[PDB]
Each structure stands twice: as C-alpha cells, then as structure tokens.
Design a binder for this molecule. Structure first.
Ligand SMILES: C[C@@H]1O[C@@H](O[C@@H]2[C@@H](O[C@H]3O[C@H](CO)[C@H](O)[C@H](O)[C@H]3O)[C@@H](O)[C@@H](CO)O[C@H]2O)[C@@H](O)[C@H](O)[C@@H]1O
Ligand SMILES: C[C@@H]1O[C@@H](O[C@@H]2[C@@H](O[C@H]3O[C@H](CO)[C@H](O)[C@H](O)[C@H]3O)[C@@H](O)[C@@H](CO)O[C@H]2O)[C@@H](O)[C@H](O)[C@@H]1O
Ligand SMILES: OC[C@H]1O[C@H](O[C@@H]2[C@@H](O)[C@@H](O)O[C@H](CO)[C@@H]2O)[C@H](O)[C@@H](O)[C@H]1O
Ligand SMILES: OC[C@H]1O[C@H](O[C@@H]2[C@@H](O)[C@@H](O)O[C@H](CO)[C@@H]2O)[C@H](O)[C@@H](O)[C@H]1O
Ligand SMILES: OC[C@H]1O[C@H](O[C@@H]2[C@@H](O)[C@@H](O)O[C@H](CO)[C@@H]2O)[C@H](O)[C@@H](O)[C@H]1O
Ligand SMILES: OC[C@H]1O[C@H](O[C@@H]2[C@@H](O)[C@@H](O)O[C@H](CO)[C@@H]2O)[C@H](O)[C@@H](O)[C@H]1O
Ligand SMILES: C[C@@H]1O[C@@H](O)[C@@H](O)[C@H](O)[C@@H]1O
Ligand SMILES: C[C@@H]1O[C@@H](O)[C@@H](O)[C@H](O)[C@@H]1O
Ligand SMILES: C[C@@H]1O[C@@H](O)[C@@H](O)[C@H](O)[C@@H]1O
Ligand SMILES: C[C@@H]1O[C@@H](O)[C@@H](O)[C@H](O)[C@@H]1O
Ligand SMILES: [Ca+2]
Ligand SMILES: [Ca+2]
Ligand SMILES: [Ca+2]
Ligand SMILES: [Ca+2]
Ligand SMILES: [Cl-]
Ligand SMILES: [Cl-]
Ligand SMILES: [Cl-]
Ligand SMILES: [Cl-]
Lengths: 292, 292
C-alpha cells in the first residue's frame, strides 16, 4: 500500500513527470508529461496522496502548488479522456477524483486507476515531449505497458520516519528529548533549504550576546521555513521539514542552538549552522532537545 | 546588593526618571530628569546594570537603547559635574563609568556613587521639569536628601525568576520540561507584546492544517519578538521575554501550541493565543514543554 505522502510521479518508460500545466489552479488545467531536474523542488510536479477511509488502496491526489485535484474529465471510461486539475477536497466522494494506486507487475512502479471508470493514467504514446497528453485509457493491472506505469518517488517523511533518522544519529545526548509538531513533512533539497536561509536575511544578522545569539538564529530559520511553506503551497495537510536542536559539547561546559534537515535518502539527519549556512555531519555538540 | 538587570530609575522626591536625552548615542549626550508613562516601554530611560567582578556593589550602567554608558565628565569630584552618555564597555576599568549603587537610609531607594570621584548622582534642585540637569554632587550615604535618592524599578527577570513564575502556575502538566535559552529578560507590557504581534503580520495569517497551524503561529510570534529585540536596542547582554508552550487538554486527546508572557509584578505567567491576540489566565491546556 502506497503510504500517505507527497510524491513526484515519474513515467517508467521515459523520464517525464506528472505535471499540472503552469501550476494553474483553474478547473480543467491539463495534466501533462514534463521533464524534471533531480534534487530540486519541481514546482508543478508534487502530489499529496491522501488515503480514503475504508476504501482499500484509493486516494485523492492533490497538486501541492495549486491545491487542485487530479480529475478524470466527467469520469468517462473512453480511452483518451482528459486528466486535469480540478477543484475538490481531500476526502471527496466524487469518483472523478478518486484513484486506486497499486504496484504494477514490475513490483516497483505503480498503476493509477480511476475508481469510477476503472481506466488507467496513461502517458499517451509514451511521448517524452514536454506537454504530452496524459489521459485515462483502457488497460489491465498486470500488463507491462510502460505508458501506464509510474514511479512514486517519495518526497516527504512521516513524523515516525523523521524520529527514526534522528535516533540513528550518533550525536544525540543521553538526556535527549524530541518534540513533534506535525505529521508529514516535505523534505527539502539543501539548495532550497539554503535559499530560504538567504531569503530570511539571516546571512546579514550579527551575533550579539543574548539579544541575537545562537538560539535566535535557529528559531528564526525555523520560522522562515514555516513562512515559506505557507506562502509557497496552496495544498494543506503537510508541513516543511526544518528542526531546531539544543546541544552540549563533549566537555559538558558549552551549549549551542542550531538547525537540522534530512539526507536525500531520508534515512539520516544533517546539521545546519544558521549563523553561516554550513551543513555538517558533526556540529561539535550532542543534542539534548529538538523540536520539528 | 542590586541584582544584575534592567532598571527604570526614578527620583525619590519627584516622578522624574533618569533619561539619556533623545536616546542619542553621541558621546557627551546629557543625562537628564524626564517624566514617564507606567506600563509602557520608556525608550530612553532603561539601564542595564552589569556587576563588576570582585568590586563590591559596583556596576556599569548601559542605556538599553543607545548602548552607551553613564559617564561622569572627566571624573571630576566638583559638584555640578555633568553626567552624560559615553562610549564604553560592560566591564571597563574607566572609573568615570563605574558606579557603586547601595540602599539609601530609607532602605528602599538607592544612592548612586561614582567609584572614582565618590560623588553622587543628583537631580539638581529636585527640579521636576523635563530635561533637568543631572550632575555628580557632594553627599553622604546616610542623608535624607531626595535629590540623590533613586528607585531602581526592575524591568527584567533572570532565567531563575522566569522558571519560578512558571512553577507557580497551576496549568503545568506532570511531564513538563522547560528549556532555558538566555539569562536575563526584558519583560514587556502587554501593550507592547500585542504591538509586536500586530507588526509581525500574524493577525492576518489563516490557520491551515499542518502547513500553518498552531505550532507555526507560536514559533512565528517568538521569532518576531526576537527580531524586535535586536532591531530595537543597541545594548547587548539581555534577551526579550516571550515563551513558547506545547500543552494537552484535560481529556488527554488534543494538544495545542501557544505563547506566554509574565505579569507586571513578574511573579506569574499569562498565556497568549497567537491566532487571535488574546491573553488568558487559563488557555484550556496544561503545558508539557516550554522554551523561552
Ligand atoms: C516555477 C517554474 O518552474 C520551472 O518551469 C516550470 C516547468 O518546470 C519543469 O520543467 C523545467 C523545464 O521546462 C525543468 O525541467 C524543471 O526542473 C521542471 O520542474 C514545468 O513545470 C512547466 C509546465 O507546468 O511550467 C514551468 O513553469 C522553471 O523552468 C521556471 O523558471 C520557474 O522556476
Ligand atoms: C521614542 C519616543 O519616546 C517618547 O518621547 C521621548 C521621551 O519619552 C518620555 O517622555 C514622554 C513625554 O515627553 C513620555 O512621558 C514618555 O512615556 C517618556 O518615555 C523622552 O525620553 C525624550 C527625552 O529623551 O525623548 C523623546 O523622544 C514619545 O513621546 C515619542 O513619541 C517616541 O515614541
Ligand atoms: O465544477 C465544480 C465541481 O467540481 C468537482 O466536480 C466536477 C463534477 O461535478 C463534474 O462536473 O465533473 C467535473 C470534471 O470531471 C468535476 O469532477 C467537485 O468535486 C465539485 O464539488 C464541484 O466543485
Ligand atoms: O488501445 C488499447 C490498448 O491500450 C493500452 O495500451 C495502449 C498502447 O498499446 C499504445 O497503443 O498506446 C496507448 C496510449 O498510450 C495505450 O497505452 C492497454 O494497455 C492495452 O492493454 C490495450 O487496452
Ligand atoms: O572618548 C573616547 C573614550 O571614551 C571613554 O573614556 C573617556 C575618558 O578617556 C575621558 O576622555 O573622559 C571621557 C568623559 O568622562 C570618557 O570617560 C572610554 O572609556 C574610552 O575607552 C574611549 O572610548
Ligand atoms: O551643596 C552641598 C550639599 O549638597 C548636597 O545637597 C544639595 C541640596 O542641599 C540642594 O542644595 O540641592 C543640591 C543640588 O540638587 C544638592 O542636592 C549634599 O546632599 C549635602 O550633604 C551638601 O553636601
Ligand atoms: C456528476 C457531477 O459531479 C460533480 C457535482 O458537482 C455535480 O453536481 C454533478 O453531481
Ligand atoms: C505499442 C503498443 O503498446 C500497447 C500494446 O497494447 C500495443 O499492442 C502496442 O504494443
Ligand atoms: C583619562 C582618560 O580616560 C579615558 C582614556 O580613553 C583616555 O586615554 C584617558 O586615559
Ligand atoms: C534644600 C537643601 O537640600 C540639601 C541640604 O543640604 C540643604 O541644607 C538644603 O536643605
Ligand atoms: Ca501541528
Ligand atoms: Ca537569545
Ligand atoms: Ca542564549
Ligand atoms: Ca505546523
Ligand atoms: Cl504485458
Ligand atoms: Cl503491455
Ligand atoms: Cl538627612
Ligand atoms: Cl539631607
């Protein structure tokens, strides 16, 4: 079962992602195949998959940027029927916006079936060009046809996953306590994490004893990532990953406040120094408290 | 012994405060008597008293706004010698900027003696007018003369004091843990706390599930108060009081994130709801974690 989360959905035959054209929130905006850049935010190509209660392997798919939903036009089972962005809600009963998502016969990619029509999401002709039509099409669950197979590249972590990555880290103090604030988090490439840091004004901030010292830099970075998230995305039901940590050095006589993010494989944390933009596997401190 | 801290220093004969004229950072800016408004930030009238190591009852006095120091002009013991703001440092050995501060014979107000000259800070003639000269003057430790007596009205809390106020509160969960970030904090009137909230843009922020929910409002308020502190005051060695709390309701099935401040008498906390600007003695939650 596909987990609740944010996905970049990539065709299995050609390197085209499921893209809501121009990120537009208009009803009837085409969903199309489009090329992508790895290790970036692909602004029109992120999809929040929300499981429907008691309806096995079935989801709404909400574009993270537009807040509108993947919609099979009038629910038609006719092959070639347009797939578009359309207004909706996370737990809608409109079958046009409900999608059963299960592993394909290659066991890695998925097929995406409309719950009402029983047709599948199809990159028409396998066309690799930017703006290629995606449509609902006749098919089967087991066939090999790559036009209807899709890698769900997971871009978020659950809170349990984030906690797991922290608990793997060797620089955690014995007295550590962690405070979880949300449920599901977009993990940022470092290029983006750094951009938010730059755009916050923190690179220009001077360290000043107590009035703007390490704890202020760290809390300000976290607030800047929270503001970026709300100002950047129209969908709801997720947060952006940026932690704050307090830590103590090995001698026990100095403490520090700093940020952390997650590795690209989502398995480990990496520390960020908000006073200079540096990423570190070892910041010189063991964390006694985190919130994220 | 006067404690390290921030003080509003008020003459004992007439309701004039020790005021650095126009808040100016220029060397030789006059320090004068001036009227004040209670329960406000008196922008030119706050003084950070820093104890000198191993020199009993002796301090520098740093104006919070200008970052310059109370200075007896050329250290002269002549009565009438100007007291002005002047560049310096917190632990200076320049006796012009060193002040022995001890209780007067009324046991409540203090006298302020220059360490080099042995003369006292004097509101000349007891003049109550705005801009009245303050000078160094001959005197004694024990006399009653109100021209040389000063109420040190304490405007900050230590971290121990803040912790004490939290521990007095009845809405603290059994599992509570508190994380202290700084050492000495300016306590804000609510009028100012509210102003910072308004100026942060938070009153216009919409609640959104996970992406801008209670935890984001609370962290954003705290960051806005930290930015205000640095952008507002030139002195260093103190912070501004604004806490974040996470709490749980009595049924144990809902949690919330919010802010808190201190009462005017510095003895108790008051909760602030950053989603609507309200102050509450009981927010409906018991705090399991705080940072401040
Ligand atoms: C927000 C916008 O994003 C980029 O343009 C999108 C575009 O993005 C994809 O394709 C480009 C090449 O055209 C790169 O591979 C990106 O890595 C992709 O994410 C598509 O999403 C189309 C169609 O919806 O819309 C464009 O706006 C970027 O090129 C823009 O400068 C801008 O940052
Ligand atoms: C920053 C500035 O503050 C106020 O003017 C100060 C003034 O403030 C004191 O006296 C006024 C009346 O003149 C009120 O009692 C205030 O409550 C006091 O804090 C003095 O500090 C003088 C001399 O240094 O400078 C003025 O700038 C206020 O009146 C201004 O509007 C402004 O907010
Ligand atoms: O058009 C507004 C509606 O949009 C969604 O439903 C429609 C559906 O009623 C039908 O017109 O088909 C279109 C295209 O397939 C949409 O699925 C919402 O689910 C409705 O609540 C309503 O907003
Ligand atoms: O047209 C019927 C078939 O449709 C699906 O496959 C085709 C594929 O063979 C190629 O013609 O391209 C189109 C559009 O891209 C479809 O992917 C089913 O997968 C086949 O089983 C059959 O129904
Ligand atoms: O003028 C710059 C200096 O200011 C302070 O000391 C002077 C002192 O040397 C003498 O000129 O008297 C004036 C007025 O009383 C000041 O106290 C600093 O302490 C010096 O470091 C220097 O900056
Ligand atoms: O002038 C000598 C006295 O100075 C101090 O008192 C005077 C006070 O009597 C009145 O004259 O006003 C001036 C300026 O405000 C001084 O406060 C000492 O307190 C006296 O003991 C005596 O030295
Ligand atoms: C079938 C269509 O689906 C959607 C609804 O908004 C319309 O009212 C109609 O029900
Ligand atoms: C290219 C096409 O892919 C699909 C198959 O059903 C057709 O037979 C053809 O192979
Ligand atoms: C007495 C004066 O005090 C201060 C110093 O900056 C000057 O150099 C001089 O020492
Ligand atoms: C008003 C003055 O205050 C001071 C005293 O030393 C003087 O005698 C006079 O009383
Ligand atoms: Ca939350
Ligand atoms: Ca601080
Ligand atoms: Ca600190
Ligand atoms: Ca949140
Ligand atoms: Cl096949
Ligand atoms: Cl096939
Ligand atoms: Cl007397
Ligand atoms: Cl007297």
């Amino acid at each position: 079962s596909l987990r609740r989360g944010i996905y970049h959905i990539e065709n299995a035959g050609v390197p085209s992602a499921i893209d809501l054209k121009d990120g537009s929130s208009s009803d009837g905006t085409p969903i199309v195949g489009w090329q992508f850049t790895p290790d970036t935010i692909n602004w029109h190509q992120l999809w929040l998959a929300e499981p429907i209660p008691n309806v096995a392997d079935t989801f709404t798919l909400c574009n993270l940027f537009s807040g509108t939903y993947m919609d099979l036009y009038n629910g038609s089972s006719e092959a070639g029927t347009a797939v578009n962005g359309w207004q909706g809600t996370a737990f809608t009963t409109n079958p046009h916006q409900l999608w059963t998502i299960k592993k394909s016969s290659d066991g890695t990619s998925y097929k995406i079936q409309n719950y009402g029509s029983k047709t599948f999401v199809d990159l028409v002709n396998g066309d690799s060009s930017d703006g290629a039509k995606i449509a609902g099409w006749t098919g089967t669950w087991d066939e090999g046809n790559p036009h209807q197979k899709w890698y769900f590249n997971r871009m978020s972590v659950s809170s349990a996953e984030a906690q797991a990555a922290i608990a793997r880290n060797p620089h955690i103090h014995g007295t550590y306590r962690g405070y979880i604030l949300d449920g599901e988090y977009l993990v940022l490439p470092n290029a983006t994490f750094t951009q938010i840091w730059k755009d916050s004004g923190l690179p220009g901030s001077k360290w000043r004893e107590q009035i703007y010292d390490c704890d202020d830099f760290a809390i300000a970075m976290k607030a800047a990532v929270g503001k970026w998230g709300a100002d950047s995305w129209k969908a709801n039901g997720f947060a952006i990953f940026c932690g704050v940590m307090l830590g103590v050095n090995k001698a026990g006589d100095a403490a520090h406040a700093y940020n952390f993010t997650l590795t690209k494989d989502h398995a480990d944390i990496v520390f960020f120094e908000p006073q200079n933009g540096g990423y570190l596997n070892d910041i010189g401190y063991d964390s006694y408290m985190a919130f994220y």
